């Protein structure tokens, strides 16, 4: 025989973090890689599918 029961208690309301979203950066290809450069975008469009 033995047990353990709390005579009283506490309401230990604490923190909790669940990171929801991020920066949904829609990083393009023809400008991020190729800023004001027809040459870079020309070379990258044959990569394409990437």
């Amino acid at each position: 025989n033995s047990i353990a029961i709390p005579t009283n208690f506490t309401i230990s309301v604490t923190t909790e973090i669940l990171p929801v979203s991020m920066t949904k950066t829609s990083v393009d290809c023809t400008m991020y890689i190729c800023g004001d450069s027809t040459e870079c975008s020309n070379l990258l469009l044959q990569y394409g599918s990437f």
């Binding site: 829609s26 393009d28 023809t30 400008m31 800023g35 004001d36």
Partner: protein, 49 residues
């Protein structure tokens, strides 16, 4: 539905360098009263202007 970006560039860009030269007196070297001989050609620098 995502269509495209737009890589705008109004009035292109501006090229800027500092104010006019300082300690570049080319006249007194090129309009000089005192020149040099050919085998004794002078050698003087221009710098920081």
């Amino acid at each position: 539905y995502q269509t495209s970006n737009f890589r705008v560039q109004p009035t292109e860009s501006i090229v800027r360098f500092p104010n006019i030269t300082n300690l570049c007196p080319f006249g007194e070297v090129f309009n000089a009263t005192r020149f040099a001989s050919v085998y004794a050609w002078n050698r003087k620098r221009i710098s920081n202007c």
